[PDB]
Structures are given as structure tokens and as C-alpha cells.
Amino acid sequence: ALTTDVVVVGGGPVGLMLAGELRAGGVGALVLEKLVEPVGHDRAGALHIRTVETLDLRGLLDRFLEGTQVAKGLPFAGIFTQGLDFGLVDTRHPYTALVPQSRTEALLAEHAREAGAEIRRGHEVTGLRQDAEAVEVTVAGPSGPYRVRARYAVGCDGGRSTVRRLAGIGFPGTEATVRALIGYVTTPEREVPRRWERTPDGILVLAFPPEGGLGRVVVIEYEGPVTLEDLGAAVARVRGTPLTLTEPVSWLSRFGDASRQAKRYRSGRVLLAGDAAHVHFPIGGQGLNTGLQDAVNLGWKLAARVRGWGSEELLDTYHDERHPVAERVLLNTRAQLALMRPDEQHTTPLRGFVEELLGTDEVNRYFTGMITGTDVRYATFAPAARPHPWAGRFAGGLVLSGPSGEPVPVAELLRSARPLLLDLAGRADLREATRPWSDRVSVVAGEATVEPPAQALLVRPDGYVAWAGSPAATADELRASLARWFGPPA
Amino acid sequence: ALTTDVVVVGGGPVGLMLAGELRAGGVGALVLEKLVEPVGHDRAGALHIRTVETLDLRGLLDRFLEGTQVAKGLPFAGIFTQGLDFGLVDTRHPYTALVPQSRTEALLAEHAREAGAEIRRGHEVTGLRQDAEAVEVTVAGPSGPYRVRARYAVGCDGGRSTVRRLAGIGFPGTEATVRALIGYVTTPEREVPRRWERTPDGILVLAFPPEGGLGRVVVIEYEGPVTLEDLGAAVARVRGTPLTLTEPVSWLSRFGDASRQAKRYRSGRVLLAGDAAHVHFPIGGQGLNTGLQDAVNLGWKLAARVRGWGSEELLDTYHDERHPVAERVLLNTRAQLALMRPDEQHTTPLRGFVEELLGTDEVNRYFTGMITGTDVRYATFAPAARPHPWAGRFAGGLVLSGPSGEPVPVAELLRSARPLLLDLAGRADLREATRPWSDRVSVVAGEATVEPPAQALLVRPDGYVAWAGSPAATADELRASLARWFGPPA
Ligand SMILES: Cc1cc2nc3c(=O)[nH]c(=O)nc-3n(C[C@H](O)[C@H](O)[C@H](O)COP(=O)(O)OP(=O)(O)OC[C@H]3O[C@@H](n4cnc5c(N)ncnc54)[C@H](O)[C@@H]3O)c2cc1C
Ligand SMILES: Cc1cc2nc3c(=O)[nH]c(=O)nc-3n(C[C@H](O)[C@H](O)[C@H](O)COP(=O)(O)OP(=O)(O)OC[C@H]3O[C@@H](n4cnc5c(N)ncnc54)[C@H](O)[C@@H]3O)c2cc1C
Helix, strand or coil, X not given: CCCEEEEEECCCHHHHHHHHHHHHCCCCEEEEECCCCCCCCCCCCCECHHHHHHHHCCCCHHHHHCCCEEECEEEECCEEEEEEEHHHCCCCCCCEEECCHHHHHHHHHHHHHHCCCEEEECCEEEEEEECCCCEEEEEEECCEEEEEEEEEEEECCCCCCHHHHHHCCCCCEECCCCEEEEEEEECCCCCCCCCEEEECCEEEEEECCCCCCCEEEEEEECCCCCCHHHHHHHHHHHHCCCCCCEEEEEEEEXXXXXXXXXXXXXXXXXXXXXHHCEXXXXXXXXXXXXHHHHHHHHHHHHHHHHHCCCCHHHHHHHHHHHHHHHHHHHHHHHHHHHHHCCCCCCHHHHHHHHHHHHCCHHHHHHHHHHHXXXXXXXXXXXXXXCCCCCCCCECCCCEEECCCCCEEEHXXXXXXXXXXXXXXXXXXXXXXXXXXXXXCCEEEECECCCCCCXXXXXXXXXXXXXXXXXXXXXXXXXXXXXXXXXXXXC | CCCEEEEEECCCHHXXXXXXXXXXXXXXXXXXXXXXXXXXXXXXXXXXXXXXXXXXXXXXXXXXXXXXXXXXXXXXXXXXXXXXXXXXXXXXXXXXXXXXXXXHHHHHHHHHHHCCCEEEECCEXXXXXXXXXXXXXXXXXXXXXXXXXXXXXXXXXXXXXXXXXXXXXXXXXXXCCCEEEEEEEECCCCCCCCCEEXXXXXXXXXXXXXXXXXXXXXXXXXXXXXXXXXXXXXXXXXXXXXXXXXXXXXXXXXXXXXXXXXXXXEECCEEECHHHCEECCCCCCCHHHHHHHHHHHHHHHHHHHHHCCCCHHHHHHHHHHHHXXXXXXXXXXXXXXXXXXXXXXXXXXXXXXXXXXXXXXXXHHHHHHHHHCCCCCCCCCCXXXXXXXXXXXXXXXXXXXCCCCCEEEHHHHHHHCCCEEEECCCCHHHHHHCHHHCCCCEEXXXXXXXXXXXXXXXECCCCEEEEEECCCCCHHHHHHHHHHHHCCCC
């Protein structure tokens, strides 16, 4: 603990989000980032519903939306006529925010710094040891190698995670069989169809202004340096007729569908988040979404463990909750690849039937919820009998009515990163019962009718419901949940 | 017309069904069959809900069920845990009848003969000409070649249809890329897993008694003579470990997924039915079902045309109605092939999600209806405004209450192969209005509440609703439908 409470390995968007969260939880966070200067990415990032809702309860949503384009729908597996309908899901943010990942990275960096996280760029982690008392990290710095001692170390260091490998955590999954190229390059052609198309030999996504010039190319066919020539050639194989790509080249890269996940998100004092914990083909823009939400899930649990009121069991719920979520993201990207397989004989007809189905609200809601994260709910600390219908559900989008009729968004209340007891129906017995926890937990009265009904919601710092009360609920049950979740009464 | 009213080319199950129907319509039917003796097939035929319902209204269902096994469900695209649920569909025959096609062929032959159809075996059709007055067929018979003159010729002569080719009707579609082998052979192995399995290299379906001996093998990998050695080898490639197949061999055959459909089901005095009209991979046992229903659709329309009260327009509704149906069967078999593709990287995960979906009633009902034929309804002779919700729907499964409370299955009423006017709510105005059509159309009073509501149903000889009356319906509307469908009043 000598150097800092928590060392974050990697200053990508996920590490920076995690450091923000740790600071909001009142503990020290040191971010060791390998690069001296951020690289640049695909400039077409997407932040989906549940990520947007999460940013809102952190008070970050506004700056993320400054000068931002949004989308009110999304195609599924390259199917556009019957796309994902954001209106069928319960949310007050029915849109995807189109924010370039580099901007997301800059914003989170600014925030993390403003919150008192120390960021060190050009410090690469080369070694990692842990014992009962603490974690030591070996870093390549200014006078060469030095050691950092901390209570916990979190690897948010990407798919090629150093932390994961050195902690001895397995990364089971498949190897890539799909090869994709993506580039932002200029072109001498006009009225070029800005279409997403399947052909017999692959997938082509051309995005060029009708005048010609800088545009986005993505080509997919069923690591290493990419040239403007490779891109040009691949486009030809897939499209049939060659396309003239020329400089200036703003970006050239490759990626594949290797689908892997850390077997454990936690090993003693070491934990993983983001791509360090899971990799997959970037279909439907789900990767960073998952990672940012990994971080908000872990941040307050980790801060609570450091300060002494979070239990080991609590910290264990990080893996138990987030691992199933990423496992499903991996499966769905792989399934989408099957649906997009370039293949007129069988897959084209199969796509016809899927499209019909997407025209129905129930199935459409099914996939919308899957891609946008709105279907994420947790099953933590259940009885032991059955738990309340609201337990584990997301409450960050609820809006109460205050003493004088004015709205009270639960999102704005959670901005302090403290648990909330929402008293939806009176229940002064409950509010009184929570007082010995007043230092950790906030009590807030407000009228609201939810579905299914609830008289009270004990809400976690990440917007999910830890505990829900029915009329049958006794103050004693709440004291039990308060202890189990948030530690012993003062 | 000199030789017979209608010549049927081919004495497979579809030609024999059609000849039955033509006889029930009171016109002459001559069946020219190439083979001198029926060959043998896969002995695991399946007759699905809508075929079973059709057999019932023909009074054939009983003999088809004599000593017959039935199934109360079916897997979809090799998915068994969440199979097609027959209970979610509206029917009083929620089962598949497992009848070997050879038995179906024998029964229809017996029936066709008992009904006065002449069957000629070992007479192959070699030539076909038509003019305004009639159709001439050239046949290879006892004293060699002879000519048959008829008003209409129907090609029910299989996928390699002579009639289709000689009539100049195109057969657009795909060529086969999937190669399957199927055989009934004995084996020296015991406790052999009677499982349907996907592997990395194909699909294997083993069905052997735990003692060993005669069993069914199907192997699928993504024409010509098959040997016990070919079978044995293919099984090895797909399964990994070789399997000992030995004589006696009861059957050995191959098939593929060539997916083709006649562009026209009718060319003047020549029409097509069954495999002559459509071919596809035999996944989900839909081929003969479609063909038998093609025949019941055409039989009474064709008989009515010959006798003078069926219009050309009516006869045209054969193609208009049945062509869309087979087109969808082709698409769904091709789509199912995509779902079964042996492929762990993408298709396995995709199958997981489809399986979840099949666990929902709505989606399950969707596929059940597709495979069993229960979703078939027609859109014929519509306004011109909107048509009654019951128009085009299948009414063969309705059961009325008679004068004294006793049930009156609509299936038993249709057994005469005459149109029915069902008076569900009184409407003596309607019954009186139908009297000038009494020679073609039967009137039957009986109480029943249907959903959506209907006061009267004008029902076709194949069990589908030609016309439905609301309270607003006038006798004049019915006279109009009666004329358009069933010809001028007497
Ligand atoms: C083409 C493409 C498009 C995508 N589009 C989307 C999208 O639209 N929406 C979405 O949600 N996701 C998208 N993704 C996925 C998304 O980019 C990733 O999930 C995201 O980058 C994960 O962020 P991260 O911080 O976990 O890892 P990274 O961004 O990889 O950051 C890890 C950081 O750790 C540092 N590091 C590594 N090793 C060490 C070390 N030993 N010591 C110190 N530092 C180290 C690296 O320098 C890096 O800065 C896309 C991916 C691709 C390839
Ligand atoms: C392995 C397998 C399993 C199947 N399982 C099912 C199933 O479970 N359920 C289902 O509904 N379908 C199934 N099918 C499909 C089904 O068998 C066919 O759709 C069915 O045989 C079509 O019958 P048909 O009478 O139209 O054609 P056919 O059975 O091919 O009969 C055509 C007849 O025409 C004769 N003929 C051809 N040319 C001439 C000529 N020039 N002159 C005179 N006669 C001629 C032939 O001798 C033949 O008897 C399966 C198919 C296969 C391959």
C-alpha cells in the first residue's frame, strides 16, 4: 500500500474510466500507461444505451454529447430494412452516441486527472508480484526500472494484457479465421455507393462523399502492417471491380475474430477489465461499451474494499456478474458472423427469415436489448425462496417526483457514487433503519410507480438494484441487505 | 378429349393423389406411369398437420392411420431441446403421421383405382404436343408408341419431369453443393448412440437397435450409384472413428440440395404438380406434403374446368396460390442448411441463439406453422377495399353443432368434394341465395363461433375459405362470389 491504494495498468479508455471511479470512491489511483502519446483509432465509435445511461449517472453525459451526432437505430448483422428499434426498450436515452474512441479517451483522461488520479505516460509495466499484504509492480520509467506497491492492481492493458499473462490467468477462446482490413483513405471516384454489401467473396463497407476524397473502407473476408496496396487488393477480391485508393492515408489497420475471455476476472489482489478481460470481432460496436461498464461495476466495489466496508464476497461479485456478460457478447458477435457469412446458397435465404423476425417487436426487442446492453441485469446475493422482481435490475433511468412536484432523476442522485435507499411509498420504518449506514448510504424520499411495483429500492453506485422492498418487507430484511452489501452499521 | 379428360403423367404419390381428386370431381383420369413396379424409398416418411387435415376431409385419414406411429413434435434444423411444439397451433390433429412413402403410394393407388382412374404401368411418356382444342401425349407401350388425346395433361413426373421440359417451362434454381448419403444397412456394434449429431466435418444420423443389425444411416457433407463402401467411408470422414457397415443392405441412395422451381405451373392445357414443380433438400420432410397439397388444390379446379363451370381465371389460381407456397419451402430448407452448417466457429453460437428463440411461443409457432403447413392461407379474388379476415383461411378443421347438439366436422362434409356454404349464424337470406347453385354447392346450417367472427363461410373442396360473410354481407355479395368462384347460376 506504500505507493498507492490501487494501481491501474493501462491508460486506454477502460483504465481511465476505472481510475475515475476509484477516485469517486475516495481512494488513490495510479494509472501506468505504456505509450507516451495516445494512438488514433477508427473514428466511428459507438456508445450504446446502457453506456450512455451509465455516463449520465456519473455526470459525464453532457460533455460526451457536446457537438456529438447520435443514431436512433442500428442494423443487426448487416440487416438495415428491419434494424434495431430503440423505441421498444425502456430508457430516456433511446439513441447511440457516435463518439470517436480517441475523444472518449481524451475526456476520461481529463476527468480522471481532475479527480486526482495520477497518470504516468511512457511507463510500461514489465513485472508483477503479489503476496498476502500487497501487490508489487515493476515499471520501466525515467531512471529505468522501479517498483510500485499497492493494495490492488487492475489490468486494463488491452487484449495483449501483460497483467493477465503475469498473473497466470488463462485466456481460453478461438483463434481468428476472419480477416478484416479497415482504412480511412481518399479516392478518385464520384457518386460512390455509400453501401454496406455482402458479396459471394466477402463484405464491403464503402463510405465516401459523392465528390470523392477521404472516406472509410472496411473489407471482410472469411496482426501485422497493412499497406494501401493490401487494402486496394482486398477491396478488389471482394467487390469484383477494383477501386482506386490513393494517398493521403489517414489510417490503415487490420483486425480479426479471435474470441477470447479471461477465465478469472480476479486473482487475489489482481483484477482485469476491458479488453484485458475479453476480445472479439468488433461487430455491432460492443467492445468498449462492455469495458466501460466493467469499470463502473468494479470501481466502487474496489474502492469499498480498500476503505474496509466492502466485503471479499462483494468484490467477488465483480467476476460473477461481469464474466457472464462478456461471455454473451462473444457468442453474439460469433453468431452475427455466421449471419453475415458471404454465401448465396444458404445464408442469404437464412437472412431473409431473420429479417422477417426482426419485423416483430418481441424479437426486435430481444436483439436490441442484447446489442445495447439494456437487457443486463444481475442475480447477486439472491435468497436463500425467491428475490424481489426488481433486484438486480437497472434503476439509473428512474425519475422521481420531489416534495413539490419537480422531477428528481435517479441519475443525478447517483452522481456522488454512493448507494441510495429510494423510498417510493412512505416507509419511514425503512428510512429510520438505514440511519446507522448514513455515512455510506443516502436516503431519498420521492413518489414513483414502477413496474413491477416496489415500495423501496436499495440502489448501487452503478445504478443497479441491490435490494427491493415489497409491502411485506421488514426493516430487519433491509438491515440484513445493508450489512451484506455495504458492511456493518456504524 | 378423345382418349380421356385428363392425362396424369407419373404414378408417384402426387400423380395418384391428383387422379383421386379428378375422379371425385367426376372427370376421367388416366395415369401413365413409367415404371412397371414401384421402387422403394426412405421408409421414414412424414405427413404433417395440414396434409393430415387434408387427408381427413378426403376420408383417407383412417386407412393412413391403420397401424401408424405418430410424433407429437419435431426438431428444427437439428435442434431437439426446443423442438417444434404442435400444441401452439390450431388443429385437431396435433401430430405428424410417420407413414413410409411406399405405403402412401400403395394406398393412393388403391384409392385411385377404386375411384375409376385407369392406371397404366410401364407406359412412359416420350412426347407432348398441344393445340387450342387439346393435348396429345406420345407413350411407349405394348405395341410400341401410341398417342393419347386429352383436354389437359398434368406432369406429376418427378424432379426430372419429362412434361416440364417438353412443355418448355423453365426450372430456375441453384445447383447442389451439399452431398448426402442415406442407407438402411446392418451393423456389428452394440449400444450405438441413436443420435443426430453435427461435427466439424458434417452431419451424422445413426439409428441402430442397441443389439446391432438393420438401421438407418444418413451422412451429410458440405446422382449416381452408391456402394456400401461409399457410405462406410463418408461416415468415417464425418464421424472420425470408422463404423463397420456390412450386408444385408436394404437400401442405398444419395441426394443433394439442388433447389429448383417451375417458373410456370401452367402452360395452356399442360400443368405441373409435385416434384415436377419443385425440388429441394429433404430437410424437415416437406416435399411430399407440398406435392399432395398441390394435387388437392388442382384436382377440383381442374375437374371444374373440364365440366365447364370452373373459369380460366379459377384454373389460373392454381399457379398463383401454390407457387408462392413451394417458393417458401425452398427458401426454408436452404435457410435450415445454413443453420446446420458444420462449423464451430460461428454457426454453433448462432444455433444457441436460435434455440433460445424457439423457447418462446411466438417464434416457435412461427416455425411450427412453416414446417407443418398450418400457416398456408390464400389471397385469391380479393377486393377491389378489404376482404373478410377469414377469406383464404383453412376451415377443414372446424366442427359445427348440429340441430340436436351432435358434432358435425366440416372435414366429413367436404368428403363429397363439393363447395360448402356454412351458415354459422342464421342467414336464411344467404341459404336461399345459394339455391341456384345447389347442383354444385351444398348448404349446411350449424352453430359455431369462430375467431375472428364469421356469420357464413363459403368453403372450397380443398378446405380453404373462398368467401366469408359479416353481418354487413348481403345476398348480392354472395351471388357475386358464387358466380366468380363456381360459375353461373343454374
Ligand atoms: C475497428 C474496431 C472498431 C471498434 N468499434 C467499437 C465501437 O464502436 N464501440 C465499442 O464499444 N467498441 C468498439 N471496438 C472495441 C474497442 O475498441 C475495444 O474494446 C477498446 O479499445 C477496449 O479498451 P481498453 O482500454 O480495454 O483496451 P485498449 O484500448 O487496448 O487500451 C489498453 C492500454 O493499455 C496499454 N498497455 C498495454 N500493455 C501495457 C503495459 N504492459 N504497461 C502499461 N500499459 C500497457 C496500451 O498502451 C493501451 O493504451 C472496436 C474495435 C475495433 C478493432
Ligand atoms: C431421402 C428423402 C426423404 C424424404 N422425406 C420426405 C418426407 O418425410 N416427407 C415429405 O413430404 N417428403 C419427403 N421427401 C421428398 C419426397 O420424397 C418427394 O417430394 C416426393 O417423392 C414427390 O413425389 P412426386 O410424385 O411428385 O414425384 P415422384 O415420387 O418422383 O414420382 C414421379 C413418378 O413419375 C414417373 N415418371 C417420370 N417420368 C415419366 C415419364 N416420362 N412418363 C411416365 N412416368 C414418368 C416416375 O417413375 C415416378 O413414379 C423426401 C425425399 C428424399 C430424397
